[PDB]
Design a protein around this ligand. Structure first.
Ligand code: HYE
Ligand code: HYE
Lengths: 244, 204, 250, 244, 233, 222, 196, 243
């Protein structure tokens, strides 16, 4: 029969752990590091591009920062292709919500739905889980700025500052060292770059190896704006923050 | 009986010199009973405008559907949808319900952001596209609108002039239609700016 | 009967590797070299026609395929897998885009579609990943020219120039030396021919080489006249003769 | 490595399908049965081992008819044989229903062939544990066939399978040589009764019961009928006589 | 060897054997003995009912499928229930649609085919029960032996279950005798009880331990248990 | 509607009027009834506009995919087979009445398909309410071995019979010529015999004529 | 419509008018109602043009796959495939079909499949609105084993009468000759058959 | 782990053993075949071997009539060959019904190759242990030979050979074409093309053939047919009166 070749991707270990989830997490740990920092007036998403070449087109590239909504974005750590599958269904869920209630979807509701999808691949179906971890940066009029994280297990949590991917241990300790509740978006942007800068497995931290985004409520307006920095924009902020 | 004669309403779009205008009445009734004088039939996704006449529930549904689709479009294409492309999206979306159609009369208006060329188009309830260079009419007073437009209209009118024309076409057609009126709104569209003006008309 | 293989054939190993993706990539490595170079006014993709026999008719086998009139693809790895990927790509360009918006999809989106098809063969029940890496070149009004690579995992990335397969490491290095952002299409074609020569063991001519470009519209390749807005496909496969003419100026 | 013989549709390094081959062993371990093509028909005969005196004589019929002009006999797992005949019957009814005319032997043979071959395509099914000798008369002549567990089949002048297939084949080859002009239905019936008695030596330990059937354009009108009474006994004797 | 080829019914061993089927056959041998024999006017089923404790009942081993047909089981009782229930429907179908009583030979063919499907496909399992079917149809009295392998055979008499070989040799000897017990049920039954006791060893057939069933010429298939079998102990 | 097809010595030509109606009202004075299935296989449609357009594009899409798959030029008999089997399936509910023509590796072809799925072959054909005025001209002037120019003329005159005599037809004449060895040539508005005379007066209004209640700028930028 | 198939000494001939109408309008005056479903097995179509085409197309498909596997099909087998389609879909079809074929063993054969989907083998058959007018004529003039010339004449005269009285019949008379010699296409113009 | 050799999934070397082993199965019949293109015909030769005296020689064939115009010769076990033939015939018929014209030889080839590619990718389907050589005189391409294998691969050939002694036939044919400088047998009659085919078959295999040692198929405009023992004998006689 077929049973012979079934890996059984959804069973418990004698210790009560989920093999595939643990191995997927192991996979994520080798992915470029992504960081999320929540400030009083905004949120920052920063990510290190794993592997790069002189010939890689960076102006037309995006492998870690994706817009889900006009008020929600995510940073990816893991299999890009797996991420895109989830990203697309997330984009649809947001629209369904909007069409149903004529209100943008609250950040947690969208995060919970995506995590629930992940949880599924964990309990039935016999399929491998998605080798992906997300950092969600969004805003809604009930909780304002929020920062979430979800991993292969389908579990999610909220943070003031958090990281996913490689060297999270080191990154978390550095963040837990310099983060302060009254921080400001600009302070946060700097903290993010500094943290990545000290955790990079690469020589130096150049602009061509980074993706940056912020969700701020531009005072001169009254609405929420998402800014996915352009190569030159990252190059600029890299010099200013004193990393040249 | 006729789903397109229950709520009433009209929409009309015109092309001018480097501009387009789309106007509509504000009535929503239940046969002889007037119910709302604030039912706008024009919507916009980015710089593309869409007016819908016909069964109100379908007008509302279609707008919500196109908002939904143009949002996903922008997210994937990473650019706002254009008039010509949207027109195709409308047509295929309507035909998809070929044997259980939405009882509406859509009208698209806008300026191509890259070519600056003005654009308008109309559709029947199952998607047939009508891409006129001059004007497009829709609604319970469409015969009257055809009469107004065919006479009042002339090419390359300037924004301020087209405004007067489109308004007179709308207003006088609505006054010969029992199910249209109770307010009107006109949209003057240019590459850079869009002005919306509410007109003053009879309220009977 | 009935496919009872409803479980994944690609799973995570303790180290976090996805075995089958890895193995698929290894299959790609053994494949004949193929490359793509983006110029300021076009893109060129090329590969070698490794005829498996002199009795075979190498023309009856195209490694470079037209996906849409403005997008083409080439690969390295398992030819049969590529062939069905092309059928599926051509079709998805219609079902998921042309039949909806009345126009062909932009390069990145079609690439996104192909990538999805491939990602699914990495997780769906009862299948193995595709043993190929594609290089897709195309043009669209709002993005201009572009070049993309799609791997067995479903991952894709934009390139200015790159190579895949057998001598990809060396070829990529040679491309880094000759590439600049002011290259004209003919220059890219020339660079492409040089890069491919290092990878070819035997005969090197217009009959052993397959090359296509994405450039200006070819109204002569439209098939009809009357629609001002229809100017022709930007995709064009070079003829054996066109190649040789350029080989003399090698 | 090894284990290539554990799953049904698996190719071994030498390109064989071991499960099909093991099925053949079940066939060789079965009773011997044969078929003889005559000048205007075909004859089928089989060996029926009498396990004990308790078996009601003449009751457990093994030869089966398909439609009204086809006979089928087989060696191996009897149930598998019936299964194949039930299918052949549906196959024959379908053909008649659509085309009006009863199914031609060649056409019928392939119907059985594709079905048996089908059972060597997946590991969710087991190959057929029988070799089947069948045939009849149609629009243009008589036809004899033998179908192996692999789905392989060919037209035959004479055929045998089971325990004593070698003896039988040997005897059949003699007939073929000594009768280039063709045997008659009447003769084939006797000849068949003999071949079976002879081939019974490879199982001479248990007593047996003979069973014969035929389909002759002149003797049965092209319809399949069982040899009974006088004609049967006459053939029994012809054999009992030449066995000494 | 065996261990690598007995994991499921869809696998042939190197010698052409189907172990799962053979293991199923083993469940029958572990079953209580039952006997079947017929003359030209009647057919009889004699079964030794087995009990769990001395506080338990002796599990029924005879099932009526129609007014003219029934059977005895040896092995997994649930499988007997499934197979007999299928036979009840088949008999029933024959009556309702063709107003015809189902031929015992046809019932044997249907059972053979039902059992066969569970020996060639993945996921299922062979039936683990043996059955002896008797009936009186348009061609007289009949007795059939059903094996989970799908093999069904018509006999004058036979036995299945533990130590069944005793009764079977007895019948194979008593053949010429009982086969002529026409017009006399009690004689056929006694003959059946004599054959079954040829497989005793543990105890002796008691009143709540013996189970008999008969069908024939002017006798609708009927079961006798307890007091009703006393006159045979 | 008036649509026609006319074969000539080395190809085929199809033509159509440009009026689109909603009951007795002219919704479009210059619609396009000539559709492209593939580069050299064009179609003229009558009946339900959304249907002729939708059916033409669907088969067109599949024809393109078939062409790519077979590495061959699309054949008219293929578009015909796909159209008729599609229309037959919908039992006439898809109101498409078409005149399909074109050139392919096997020559030049001219066919007609009705909503229910039946097809016809001929040297000259016409469909639509203008069908009878057009056919009257074709039956009166057609002849075998027409030159390209003669065919265009005959076809063009047939549409005119319809424009002038059929209330269901009007405005302009669109033509498409498909010749065996050349590119298909689409002649949009090959004839425009119905230009509106200058109006007697200008209705341009003096600015300020319209009473306005409220005014505001609409936000387009995100 | 007026269609007929007639068996004779050397095989069989099919004949038909060439008119298709939509009301009083003649949509096609040169229609070909004689359809090939196999080299020597053709049919005459009446009723719905759309229905009979779809049926014929499917029969041709079936006989092609039949040939690929079992060789050339008998005319009876072809009539059976037609029947299956017409009977099983009687509620949604309006098709009166005459099936005619030439076998070497069986020579010419004719099967008529009327509206309900029943099959009838006959020496000859007539169908279509126009046939009603020639029942008497055909019954008086048909003879078995006629020559090719006689048969062509019988059909030509019969159909000319059918076309004469039936407004639904007209145009030219087409015929298809099916014999061992092969397949022959005949056509007769108005000026010829009208003055018979 | 070691199961990457039982189903069609990649081995650490990126190989598909089951597809390789399926190729092994193609030579199981120990039969060799070859195909050549004439000026306006296509010929396929195939050894015919009937060992058993009890077999009806007339029913032993590895050549099939797929459609009126397409012919197909198979190298591999007969049951898998017949599976392929049935499918090919069904595909050929459906194509005509849906698209209005006869399915081209190369298209049928691509179709069958695609089906094969799938058994290569889906675990529950095993590859068929056969190589299919399709021939015809395409209305657009003229004489055509397209062959497909268990890998889902296919291509057109000027001429080709298949079986245990494939290589010897191939080099023989290669040499001939290096000499002639053209890509077909410049002969007007298929009879002579068949003769060329058999001649080179003999040279390359170093064997003589009787009328029952061969099997022949010929494709011409609008038709593909196989020769009879006698049509063959007439062929053998002709080549004899040259050597
Ligand atoms: C002609 O058939 C038709 C046209 O309005 C359409 C328009 C565009 C393409 C298909 C043809 N169709 C109709 O239904 C109209 C007549 C109704 O009596 C008209 C104008 O003839
Ligand atoms: C004849 O039966 C019929 C013909 O138009 C069709 C045309 C082609 C093949 C089938 C026969 N059928 C009709 O419905 C027509 C009359 C409509 O009033 C006619 C001419 O009788």
């Amino acid at each position: 029969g077929s049973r012979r070749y079934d890996s059984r991707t959804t069973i418990f270990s004698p210790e009560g752990r989920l093999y595939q989830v643990e191995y997927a997490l192991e996979s994520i740990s080798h992915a470029g590091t992504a960081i999320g920092i929540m400030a009083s007036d905004g949120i920052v998403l920063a990510a290190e591009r794993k592997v790069t070449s002189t010939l890689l087109e960076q102006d037309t590239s995006t492998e870690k920062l994706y817009k889900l909504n006009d008020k929600i974005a995510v940073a990816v750590a893991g299999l890009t292709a797996d991420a895109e599958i989830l990203i697309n269904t997330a984009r649809i869920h947001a629209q369904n919500y909007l069409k149903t209630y004529n209100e943008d979807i609250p950040v947690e509701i969208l995060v919970r739905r995506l995590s629930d999808i992940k949880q599924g691949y964990t309990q039935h179906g016999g399929l491998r889980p998605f080798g992906v971890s997300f950092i969600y940066a969004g805003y809604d009029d009930r909780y304002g700025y929020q920062l979430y994280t979800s991993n292969p297990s389908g579990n999610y949590t909220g943070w003031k500052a958090i990281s996913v991917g490689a060297n999270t241990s080191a990154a978390q300790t550095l963040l837990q060292m310099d983060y302060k509740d009254d921080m400001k978006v600009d302070d946060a942007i700097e903290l993010a770059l500094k943290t990545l800068s000290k955790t990079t497995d690469s020589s130096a931290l150049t602009y061509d190896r980074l993706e940056f985004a912020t969700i701020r409520k531009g005072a001169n307006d009254g609405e929420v704006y998402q800014k996915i920095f352009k190569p030159q924009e990252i190059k600029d902020i890299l010099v200013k923050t004193g990393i040249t | 009986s006729d789903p397109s004669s229950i709520n009433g309403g009209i929409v009309v779009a015109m092309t001018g010199k480097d501009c387009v205008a789309i106007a509509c009445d504000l009535r929503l009734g239940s046969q002889s009973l007037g119910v709302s004088n604030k039912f706008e039939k024009i919507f916009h996704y980015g710089h593309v405008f869409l007016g819908i006449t016909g069964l109100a529930t379908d007008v509302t549904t279609l707008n919500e559907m196109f908002r939904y689709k143009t949002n996903l479009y922008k997210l994937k294409e990473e650019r706002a949808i254009e008039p010509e492309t949207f027109t195709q999206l409308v047509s295929s979306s309507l035909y998809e319900r070929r044997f259980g159609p939405y009882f509406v009369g859509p009208v698209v208006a806008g300026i191509n952001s890259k070519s600056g060329k003005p654009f308008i188009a109309g559709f029947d309830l199952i998607g047939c596209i009508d891409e006129a260079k001059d004007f497009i009419v829709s609604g319970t007073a469409s015969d009257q609108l055809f009469g107004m437009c065919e006479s009042l209209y002339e090419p390359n009118l300037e924004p301020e002039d087209l405004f007067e024309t489109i308004s007179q076409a709308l207003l006088n057609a609505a006054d010969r239609d029992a199910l249209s009126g109770w307010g009107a709104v006109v949209y003057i569209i240019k590459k850079d700016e869009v002005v919306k003006r509410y007109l003053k008309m009879r309220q009977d | 009967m009935t496919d009872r293989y409803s479980f994944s054939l690609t799973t995570f190993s303790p180290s976090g590797k996805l075995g089958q993706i890895d193995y698929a990539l290894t299959a790609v490595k053994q494949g004949v070299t193929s490359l793509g170079i983006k110029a300021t006014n076009g893109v060129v993709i090329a590969t070698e026609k490794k005829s498996s026999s002199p009795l075979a008719m190498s023309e009856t086998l195209s490694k470079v395929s037209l996906l849409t009139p403005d997008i083409g693809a080439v690969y390295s790895g398992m030819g049969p897998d590529y062939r069905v990927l092309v059928d599926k790509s051509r079709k998805v360009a219609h079902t998921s885009y042309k039949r909806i918006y009345g126009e062909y999809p932009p390069t990145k989106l079609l690439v996104s579609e192909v990538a999805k098809i491939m990602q699914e063969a990495t997780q769906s029940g009862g299948v193995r990943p595709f043993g190929v890496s594609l290089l897709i070149a195309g043009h669209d009004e709002f993005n201009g020219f572009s070049l993309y690579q799609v791997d067995p995992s479903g991952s894709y990335f934009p390139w200015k120039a790159t190579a895949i397969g057998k001598g990809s490491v060396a070829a990529k290095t040679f491309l880094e030396k000759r590439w600049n952002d002011e290259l004209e299409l003919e220059d890219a074609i020339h660079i492409a021919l040089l890069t491919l020569k290092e990878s070819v063991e035997g005969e090197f001519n217009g009959d052993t080489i397959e090359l296509a470009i994405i450039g200006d519209e070819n109204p002569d390749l439209l098939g009809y006249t009357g629609i001002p807005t229809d100017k022709g496909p930007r995709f064009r496969k070079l003829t054996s003769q066109e190649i040789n003419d350029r080989l003399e100026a090698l | 490595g090894t284990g290539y013989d554990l799953s049904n549709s698996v190719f071994s390094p030498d390109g064989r399908n071991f499960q099909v081959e093991y099925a053949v062993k079940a066939v060789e371990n079965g009773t011997t049965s044969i078929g003889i093509k005559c000048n205007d028909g075909v004859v089928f005969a089989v060996e029926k081992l009498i396990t004990s005196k308790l078996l009601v004589p003449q009751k457990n019929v093994k030869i089966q008819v398909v439609d009204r002009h086809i006979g089928c006999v087989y060696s191996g797992l009897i149930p598998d044989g019936r299964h194949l005949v039930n299918r052949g019957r549906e196959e024959a009814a379908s053909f008649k229903k659509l085309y009006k005319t009863p199914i031609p032997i060649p056409a019928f043979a392939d119907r059985l062939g594709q079905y048996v071959q089908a059972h060597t395509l997946y590991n969710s099914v087991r190959p057929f544990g029988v070799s089947t000798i069948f045939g009849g008369v149609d629009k243009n002549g008589a036809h004899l066939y033998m179908l192996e567990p692999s789905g392989s089949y060919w037209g035959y002048k004479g055929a045998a399978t089971g325990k004593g297939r070698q003896s039988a084949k040997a005897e059949l080859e003699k007939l073929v040589d000594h009768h280039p002009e063709g045997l008659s239905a009447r003769e084939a019936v006797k000849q068949a009764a003999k071949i079976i008695y002879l081939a019974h030596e490879d199982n001479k330990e248990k007593d047996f019961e003979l069973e014969i059937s035929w389909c002759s354009l002149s003797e049965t009108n092209g319809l399949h009928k069982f040899v009974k009474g006088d004609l049967l006994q006459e053939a029994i004797d012809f054999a009992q006589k030449e066995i000494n | 060897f065996r261990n690598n080829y007995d994991g499921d019914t869809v696998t042939f061993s190197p010698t052409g054997r189907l172990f799962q089927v053979e293991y199923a056959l083993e469940a029958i041998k572990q079953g209580s003995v039952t006997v079947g024999l017929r003359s030209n006017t009647h057919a009889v089923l004699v079964a030794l009912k087995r009990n769990a404790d001395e506080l338990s009942s002796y599990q029924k081993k005879i099932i009526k499928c129609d007014e003219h047909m029934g059977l005895s089981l040896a092995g997994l009782a649930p499988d007997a229930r499934v197979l007999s229930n299928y036979l009840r429907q088949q008999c029933n179908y024959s009556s309702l649609v063709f107003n015809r009583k189902l031929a015992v030979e046809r019932a044997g063919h249907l059972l053979c085919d039902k059992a066969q499907k569970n020996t060639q496909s993945y996921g299922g399992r062979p039936y683990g029960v043996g059955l002896l079917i008797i009936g009186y149809d348009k061609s007289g009295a009949h007795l059939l032996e059903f094996q989970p392998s799908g093999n069904v055979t018509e006999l004058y008499g036979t036995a299945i279950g533990a130590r069944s070989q005793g009764a079977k040799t007895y019948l194979e000897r008593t053949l010429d005798t009982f086969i002529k017990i026409d017009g006399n049920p009690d004689e056929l039954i006694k003959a059946g009880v004599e054959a079954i006791s040829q497989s005793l060893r543990d105890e002796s057939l008691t009143v709540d331990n013996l189970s008999i069933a008969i069908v024939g010429k002017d006798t609708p298939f009927t079961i006798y248990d307890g007091e009703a079998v006393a006159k045979y102990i | 509607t008036t649509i026609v097809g006319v074969k000539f010595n080395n190809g085929v030509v199809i033509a159509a009027d440009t009026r689109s109606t909603q009951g007795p009202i002219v919704a479009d004075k210059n619609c396009a009834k000539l559709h492209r299935i593939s580069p050299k296989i064009w179609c003229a449609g009558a009946g339900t506009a959304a249907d002729t357009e939708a059916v033409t594009q669907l088969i067109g899409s599949n024809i393109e995919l078939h062409s790519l798959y077979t590495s061959r030029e699309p054949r008219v008999v293929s578009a015909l087979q796909m159209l008729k089997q599609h229309l037959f399936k919908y039992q006439g509910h898809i109101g498409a009445y078409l005149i399909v023509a074109g050139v392919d590796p096997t020559g030049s072809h001219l066919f007609s398909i009705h909503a229910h799925g039946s097809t016809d072959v001929g040297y000259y054909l016409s469909l639509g309410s203008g069908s009878l005025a057009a056919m009257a001209v074709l039956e009166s002037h057609w002849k075998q071995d027409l030159t390209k120019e003669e065919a265009i003329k005959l076809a063009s005159d047939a549409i005119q019979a319809g424009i002038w005599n059929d209330l269901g037809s009007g405005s302009n004449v669109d033509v498409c010529v498909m010749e065996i060895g050349k590119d298909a040539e689409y002649l949009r508005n090959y004839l425009t015999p119905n230009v509106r005379e200058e109006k007697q007066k200008s209705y341009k209004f003096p600015r300020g004529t319209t009473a306005v209640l409220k005014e505001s700028i609409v936000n387009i930028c995100d | 419509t007026s269609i007929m198939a007639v068996t004779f000494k050397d095989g069989v001939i099919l004949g038909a008018d060439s008119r298709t109408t939509t009301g009083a309008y003649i949509a096609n005056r040169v229609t070909d109602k004689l359809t090939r479903v196999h080299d020597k097995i053709w049919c005459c179509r009446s009723g719905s043009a759309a229905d009979t085409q779809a049926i014929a197309d499917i029969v041709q498909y079936h006989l092609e796959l039949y040939t690929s596997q079992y060789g050339t099909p008998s005319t009876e087998t072809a009539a059976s495939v037609f029947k299956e389609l017409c009977y099983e879909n009687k509620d949604n079809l309006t098709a009166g079909i005459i099936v005619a074929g030439y076998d070497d063993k069986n020579k010419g054969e004719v099967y008529t499949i009327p509206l309900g989907g029943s099959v009838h083998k006959l020496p000859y058959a007539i169908a279509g609105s126009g046939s009603t007018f020639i029942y008497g004529y055909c019954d008086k003039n048909f003879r078995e084993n006629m020559s090719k010339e006689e048969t062509v004449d019988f059909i030509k005269h019969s159909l000319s009468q059918a076309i004469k009285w039936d407004g639904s019949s007209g145009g030219v008379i087409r015929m298809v000759v099916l014999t061992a010699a092969g397949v022959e296409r005949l056509i007769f113009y108005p000026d010829e058959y009208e003055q018979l | 782990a070691g199961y990457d050799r039982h189903i069609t999934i990649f081995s650490p070397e990126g190989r598909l053993y089951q597809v390789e082993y399926a190729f092994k199965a193609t030579n199981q019949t120990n039969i060799n075949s070859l195909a050549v293109r004439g000026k306006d015909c296509t010929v396929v030769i195939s050894q015919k071997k009937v060992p058993d005296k009890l077999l009806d020689p007339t029913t032993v064939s590895y050549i099939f009539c797929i459609s009126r115009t397409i012919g197909m010769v198979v190298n591999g076990p007969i049951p898998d060959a017949r599976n392929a033939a049935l499918r090919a015939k069904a595909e050929a018929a459906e194509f005509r019904y849906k698209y209005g014209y006869d399915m081209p030889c190369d298209v049928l080839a691509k179709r069958m190759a695609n089906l094969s590619q799938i058994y290569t990718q889906r675990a529950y389907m095993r590859p068929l242990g056969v190589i299919l050589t399709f021939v015809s005189v395409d209305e657009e391409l003229g004489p055509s030979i397209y062959k497909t294998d268990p890998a889902g691969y296919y291509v057109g050939y000027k001429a080709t050979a298949t079986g245990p002694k494939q290589q010897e036939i191939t080099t023989n044919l290669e040499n001939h074409f290096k000499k002639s400088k053209i890509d077909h047998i410049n002969e007007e009659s298929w009879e002579k093309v068949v003769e060329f085919a058999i001649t080179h078959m003999i040279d390359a295999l170093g064997t003589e053939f009787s009328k029952n040692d061969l099997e022949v198929g010929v494709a011409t405009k609008d038709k593909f047919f196989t020769l009879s023992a006698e049509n063959i004998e007439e062929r053998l006689v002709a080549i004899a009166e040259q050597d």
